[PDB]
PDB file of C-alpha atoms and ligand atoms in Angstrom:
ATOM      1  CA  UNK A   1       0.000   0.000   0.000  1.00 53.16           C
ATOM      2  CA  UNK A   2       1.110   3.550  -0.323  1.00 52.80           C
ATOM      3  CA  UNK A   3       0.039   7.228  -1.893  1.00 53.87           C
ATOM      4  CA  UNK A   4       1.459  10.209  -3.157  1.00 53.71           C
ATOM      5  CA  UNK A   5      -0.382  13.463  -1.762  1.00 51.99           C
ATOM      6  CA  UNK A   6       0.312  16.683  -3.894  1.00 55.83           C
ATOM      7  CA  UNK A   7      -1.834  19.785  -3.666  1.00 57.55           C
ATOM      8  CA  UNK A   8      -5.234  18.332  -3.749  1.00 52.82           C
ATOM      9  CA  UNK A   9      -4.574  15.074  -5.025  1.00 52.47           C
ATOM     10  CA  UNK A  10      -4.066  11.851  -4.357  1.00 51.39           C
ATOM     11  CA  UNK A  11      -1.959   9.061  -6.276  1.00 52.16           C
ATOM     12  CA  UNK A  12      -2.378   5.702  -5.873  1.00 49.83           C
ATOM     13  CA  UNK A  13      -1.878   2.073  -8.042  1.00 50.31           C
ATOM     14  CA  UNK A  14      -5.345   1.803  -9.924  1.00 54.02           C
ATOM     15  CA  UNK A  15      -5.226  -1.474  -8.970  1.00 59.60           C
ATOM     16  CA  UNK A  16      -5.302  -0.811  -5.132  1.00 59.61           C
ATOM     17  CA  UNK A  17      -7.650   2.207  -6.062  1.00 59.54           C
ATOM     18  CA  UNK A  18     -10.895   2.281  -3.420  1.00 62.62           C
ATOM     19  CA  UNK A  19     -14.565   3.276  -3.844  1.00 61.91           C
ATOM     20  CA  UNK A  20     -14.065   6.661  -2.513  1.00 62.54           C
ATOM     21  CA  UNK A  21     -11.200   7.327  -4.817  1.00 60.70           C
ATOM     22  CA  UNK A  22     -12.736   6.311  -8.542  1.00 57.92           C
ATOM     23  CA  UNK A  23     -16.353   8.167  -6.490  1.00 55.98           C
ATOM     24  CA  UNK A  24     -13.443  11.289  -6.807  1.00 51.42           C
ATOM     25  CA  UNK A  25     -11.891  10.153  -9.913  1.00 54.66           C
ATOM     26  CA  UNK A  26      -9.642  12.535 -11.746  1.00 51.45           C
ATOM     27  CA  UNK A  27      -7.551  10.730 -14.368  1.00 49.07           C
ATOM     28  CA  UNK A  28      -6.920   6.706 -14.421  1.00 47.83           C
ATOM     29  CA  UNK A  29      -4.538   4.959 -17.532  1.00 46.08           C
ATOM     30  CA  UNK A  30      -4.658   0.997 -17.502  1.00 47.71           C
ATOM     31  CA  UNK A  31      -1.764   0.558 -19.242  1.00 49.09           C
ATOM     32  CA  UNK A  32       0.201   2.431 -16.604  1.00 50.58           C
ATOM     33  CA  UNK A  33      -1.110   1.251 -13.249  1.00 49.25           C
ATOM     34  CA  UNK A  34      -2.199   4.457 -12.313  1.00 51.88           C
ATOM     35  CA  UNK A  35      -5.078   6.322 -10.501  1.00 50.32           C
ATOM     36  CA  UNK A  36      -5.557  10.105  -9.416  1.00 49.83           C
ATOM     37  CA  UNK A  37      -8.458  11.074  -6.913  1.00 48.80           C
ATOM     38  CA  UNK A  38      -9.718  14.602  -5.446  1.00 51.25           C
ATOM     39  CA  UNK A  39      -8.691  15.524  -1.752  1.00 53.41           C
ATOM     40  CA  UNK A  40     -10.309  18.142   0.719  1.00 55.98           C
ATOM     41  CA  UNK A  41      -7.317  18.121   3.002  1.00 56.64           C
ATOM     42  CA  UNK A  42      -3.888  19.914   0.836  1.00 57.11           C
ATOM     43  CA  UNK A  43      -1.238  17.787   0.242  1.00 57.17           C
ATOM     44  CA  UNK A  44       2.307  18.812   0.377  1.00 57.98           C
ATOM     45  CA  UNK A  45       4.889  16.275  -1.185  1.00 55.43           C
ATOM     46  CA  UNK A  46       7.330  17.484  -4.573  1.00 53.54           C
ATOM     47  CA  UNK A  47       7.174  15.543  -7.447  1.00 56.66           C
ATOM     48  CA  UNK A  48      10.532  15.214  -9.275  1.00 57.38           C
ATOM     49  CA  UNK A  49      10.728  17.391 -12.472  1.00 59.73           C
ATOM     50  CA  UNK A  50      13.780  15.610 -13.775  1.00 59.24           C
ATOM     51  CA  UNK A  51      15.855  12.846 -15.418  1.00 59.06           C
ATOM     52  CA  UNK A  52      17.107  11.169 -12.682  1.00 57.72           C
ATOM     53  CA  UNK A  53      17.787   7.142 -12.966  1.00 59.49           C
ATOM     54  CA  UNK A  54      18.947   6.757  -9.254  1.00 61.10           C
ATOM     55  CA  UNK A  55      17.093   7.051  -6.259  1.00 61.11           C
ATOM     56  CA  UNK A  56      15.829   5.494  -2.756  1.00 61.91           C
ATOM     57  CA  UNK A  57      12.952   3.215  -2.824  1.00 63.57           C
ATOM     58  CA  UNK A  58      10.507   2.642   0.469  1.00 61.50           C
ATOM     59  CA  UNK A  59      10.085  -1.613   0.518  1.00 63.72           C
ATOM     60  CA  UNK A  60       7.463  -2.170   3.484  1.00 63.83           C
ATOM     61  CA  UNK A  61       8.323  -6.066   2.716  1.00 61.77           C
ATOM     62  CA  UNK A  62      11.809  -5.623   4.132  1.00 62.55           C
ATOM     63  CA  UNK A  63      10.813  -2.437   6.735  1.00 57.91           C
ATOM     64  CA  UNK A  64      13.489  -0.440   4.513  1.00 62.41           C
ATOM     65  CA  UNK A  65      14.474   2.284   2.112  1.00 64.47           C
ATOM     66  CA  UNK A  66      17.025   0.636  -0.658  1.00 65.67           C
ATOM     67  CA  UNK A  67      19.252   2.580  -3.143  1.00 67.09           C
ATOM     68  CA  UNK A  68      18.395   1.547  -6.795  1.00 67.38           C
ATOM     69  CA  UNK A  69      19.637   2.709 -10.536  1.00 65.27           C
ATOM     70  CA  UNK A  70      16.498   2.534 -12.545  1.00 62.99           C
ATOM     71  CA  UNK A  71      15.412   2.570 -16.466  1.00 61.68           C
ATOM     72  CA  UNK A  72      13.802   5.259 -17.921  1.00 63.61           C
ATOM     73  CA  UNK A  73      10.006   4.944 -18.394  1.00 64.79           C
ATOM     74  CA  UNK A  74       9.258   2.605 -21.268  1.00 62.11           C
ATOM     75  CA  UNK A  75       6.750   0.240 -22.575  1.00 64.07           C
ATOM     76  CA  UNK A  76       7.482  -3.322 -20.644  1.00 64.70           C
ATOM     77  CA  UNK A  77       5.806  -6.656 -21.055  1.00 61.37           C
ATOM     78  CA  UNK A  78       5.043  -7.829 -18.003  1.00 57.41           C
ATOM     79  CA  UNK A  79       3.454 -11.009 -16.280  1.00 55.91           C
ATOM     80  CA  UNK A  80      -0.073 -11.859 -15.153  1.00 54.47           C
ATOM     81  CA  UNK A  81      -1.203 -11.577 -11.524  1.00 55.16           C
ATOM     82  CA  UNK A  82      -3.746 -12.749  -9.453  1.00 60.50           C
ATOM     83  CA  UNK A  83      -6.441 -10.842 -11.153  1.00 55.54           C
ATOM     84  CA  UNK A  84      -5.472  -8.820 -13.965  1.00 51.62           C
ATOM     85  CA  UNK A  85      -3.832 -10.654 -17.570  1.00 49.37           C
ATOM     86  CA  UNK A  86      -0.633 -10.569 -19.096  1.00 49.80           C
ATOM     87  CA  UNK A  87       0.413  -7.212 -20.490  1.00 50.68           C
ATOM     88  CA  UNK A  88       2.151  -4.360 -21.801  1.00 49.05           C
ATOM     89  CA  UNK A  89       2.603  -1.699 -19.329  1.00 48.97           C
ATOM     90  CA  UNK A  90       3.479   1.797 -19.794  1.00 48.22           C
ATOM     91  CA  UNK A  91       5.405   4.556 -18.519  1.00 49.74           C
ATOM     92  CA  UNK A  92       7.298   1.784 -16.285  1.00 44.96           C
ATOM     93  CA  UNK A  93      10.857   1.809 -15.030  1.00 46.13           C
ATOM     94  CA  UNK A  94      12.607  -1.102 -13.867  1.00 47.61           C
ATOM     95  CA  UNK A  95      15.733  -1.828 -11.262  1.00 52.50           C
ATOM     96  CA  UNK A  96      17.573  -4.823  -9.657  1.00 52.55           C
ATOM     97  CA  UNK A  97      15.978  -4.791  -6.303  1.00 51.40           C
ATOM     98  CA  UNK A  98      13.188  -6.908  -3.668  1.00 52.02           C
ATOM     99  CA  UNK A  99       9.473  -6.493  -4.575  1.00 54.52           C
ATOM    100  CA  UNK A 100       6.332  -8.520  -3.129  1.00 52.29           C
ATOM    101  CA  UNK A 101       2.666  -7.571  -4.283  1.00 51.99           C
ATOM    102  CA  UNK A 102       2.336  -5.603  -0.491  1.00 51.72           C
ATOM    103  CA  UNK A 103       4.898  -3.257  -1.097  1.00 51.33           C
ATOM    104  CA  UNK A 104       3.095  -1.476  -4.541  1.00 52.91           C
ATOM    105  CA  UNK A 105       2.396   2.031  -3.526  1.00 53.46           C
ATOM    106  CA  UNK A 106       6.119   2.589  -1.930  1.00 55.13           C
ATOM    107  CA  UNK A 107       7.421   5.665  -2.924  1.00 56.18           C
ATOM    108  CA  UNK A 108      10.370   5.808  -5.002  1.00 56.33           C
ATOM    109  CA  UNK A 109      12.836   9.563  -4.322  1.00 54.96           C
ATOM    110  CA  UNK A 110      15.415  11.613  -5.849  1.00 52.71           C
ATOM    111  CA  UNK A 111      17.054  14.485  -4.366  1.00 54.28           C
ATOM    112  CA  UNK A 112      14.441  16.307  -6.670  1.00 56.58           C
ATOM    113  CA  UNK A 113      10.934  14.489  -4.858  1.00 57.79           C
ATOM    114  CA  UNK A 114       8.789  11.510  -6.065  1.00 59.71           C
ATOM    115  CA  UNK A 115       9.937  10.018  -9.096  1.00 62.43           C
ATOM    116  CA  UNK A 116       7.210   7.036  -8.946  1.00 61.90           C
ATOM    117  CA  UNK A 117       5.374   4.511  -7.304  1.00 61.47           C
ATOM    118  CA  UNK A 118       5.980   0.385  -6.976  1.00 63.47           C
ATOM    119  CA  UNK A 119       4.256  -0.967  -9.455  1.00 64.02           C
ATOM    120  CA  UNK A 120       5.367  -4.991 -10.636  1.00 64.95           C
ATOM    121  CA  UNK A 121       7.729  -7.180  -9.429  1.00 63.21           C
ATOM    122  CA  UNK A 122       8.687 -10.836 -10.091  1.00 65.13           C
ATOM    123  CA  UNK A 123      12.649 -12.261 -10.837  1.00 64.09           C
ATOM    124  CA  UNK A 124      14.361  -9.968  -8.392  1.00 64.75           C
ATOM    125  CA  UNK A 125      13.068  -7.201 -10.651  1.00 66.27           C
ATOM    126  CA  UNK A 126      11.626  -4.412  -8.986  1.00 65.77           C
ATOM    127  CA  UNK A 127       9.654  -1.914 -11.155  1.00 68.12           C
ATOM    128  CA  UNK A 128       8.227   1.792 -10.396  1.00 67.99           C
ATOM    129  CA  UNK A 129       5.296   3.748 -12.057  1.00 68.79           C
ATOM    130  CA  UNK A 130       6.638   7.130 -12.668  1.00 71.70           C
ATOM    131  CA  UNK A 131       4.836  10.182 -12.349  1.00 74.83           C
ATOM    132  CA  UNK A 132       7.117  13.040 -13.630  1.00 72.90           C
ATOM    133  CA  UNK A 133       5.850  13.365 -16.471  1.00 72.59           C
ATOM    134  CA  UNK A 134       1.972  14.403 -15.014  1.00 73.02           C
ATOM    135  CA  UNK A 135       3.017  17.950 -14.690  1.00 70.89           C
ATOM    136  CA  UNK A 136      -0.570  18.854 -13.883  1.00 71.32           C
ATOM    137  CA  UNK A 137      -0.162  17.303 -10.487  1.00 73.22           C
ATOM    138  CA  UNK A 138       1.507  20.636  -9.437  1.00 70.99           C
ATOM    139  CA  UNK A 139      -0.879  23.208 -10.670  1.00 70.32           C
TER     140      UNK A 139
HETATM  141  C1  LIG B 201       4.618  -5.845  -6.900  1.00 68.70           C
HETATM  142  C2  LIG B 201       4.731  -7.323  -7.170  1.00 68.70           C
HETATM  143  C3  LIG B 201       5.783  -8.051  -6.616  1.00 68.70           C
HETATM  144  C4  LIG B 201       5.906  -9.412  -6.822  1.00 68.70           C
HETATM  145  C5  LIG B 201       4.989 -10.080  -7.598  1.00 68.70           C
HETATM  146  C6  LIG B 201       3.932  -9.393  -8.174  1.00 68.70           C
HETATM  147  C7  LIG B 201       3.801  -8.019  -7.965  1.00 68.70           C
HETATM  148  N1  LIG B 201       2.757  -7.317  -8.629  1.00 68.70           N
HETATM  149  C8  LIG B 201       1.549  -7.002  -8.100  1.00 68.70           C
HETATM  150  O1  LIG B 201       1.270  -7.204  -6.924  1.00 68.70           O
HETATM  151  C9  LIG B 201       0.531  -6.438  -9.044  1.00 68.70           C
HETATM  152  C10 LIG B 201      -0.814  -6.681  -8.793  1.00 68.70           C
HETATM  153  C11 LIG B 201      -1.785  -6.198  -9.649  1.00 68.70           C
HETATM  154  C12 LIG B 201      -1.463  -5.458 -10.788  1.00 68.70           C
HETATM  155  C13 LIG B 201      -2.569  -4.930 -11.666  1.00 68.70           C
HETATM  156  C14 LIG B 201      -0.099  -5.225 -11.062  1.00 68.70           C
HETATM  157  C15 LIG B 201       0.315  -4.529 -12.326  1.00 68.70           C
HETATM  158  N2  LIG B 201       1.225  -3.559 -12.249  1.00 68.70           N
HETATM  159  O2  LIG B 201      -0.179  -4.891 -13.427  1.00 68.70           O
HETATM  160  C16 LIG B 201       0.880  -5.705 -10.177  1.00 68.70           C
HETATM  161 ZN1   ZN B 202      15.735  13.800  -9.793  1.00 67.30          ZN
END
């Protein structure tokens, strides 16, 4: 589990999305894993405006924040879970590191802010949704 809270809105993996946020829905993509809902409360967290491919990522599997270099965001095939099919996600960066399906929605940091979310995982693979590129989150 995990969100991203900037100004007044809320990030989250669509797949982990609840009834109150797609009752709030702002903006959902399927191929990328993600979901944006309305807040009342303001946020305050910075997301990265930047090219960055190293970071920290939170891993609530492991109670710890690991050091990763990452991909940039591309188009990845990736395997079927419990639920959902086999497919081609977007917008997805990858990096040697530990991943279980409880640790999607960890936050992964630059010295800039939030780069991205977890998002997959599977053959010591660890990969992040990234969110830099949504540069309406900040206005
Ligand atoms: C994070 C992880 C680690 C190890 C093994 C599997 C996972 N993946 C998941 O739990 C997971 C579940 C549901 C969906 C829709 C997606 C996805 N991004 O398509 C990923
Ligand atoms: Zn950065």
């Amino acid at each position: 589990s995990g969100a991203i809270y900037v100004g007044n809105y809320r990030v989250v993996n669509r797949h982990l999305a609840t009834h109150n946020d797609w009752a709030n829905l702002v903006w959902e993509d399927s191929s990328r894993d993600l979901l944006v809902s309305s807040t009342t409360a303001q946020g305050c967290d910075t997301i990265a405006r930047c090219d960055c491919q190293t970071g920290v990522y939170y891993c609530s599997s492991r109670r710890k924040h690991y050091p990763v270099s990452f991909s940039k965001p591309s188009l990845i095939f990736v395997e079927a879970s419990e639920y959902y099919p086999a497919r081609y996600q977007s917008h997805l960066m990858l990096a040697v590191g530990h991943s279980e399906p409880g640790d999607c929605g960890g936050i992964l940091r630059c010295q800039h802010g939030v780069v991205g979310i977890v998002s997959t995982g599977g053959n010591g693979l660890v990969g992040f949704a990234d969110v830099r590129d949504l540069l309406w989150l900040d206005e």
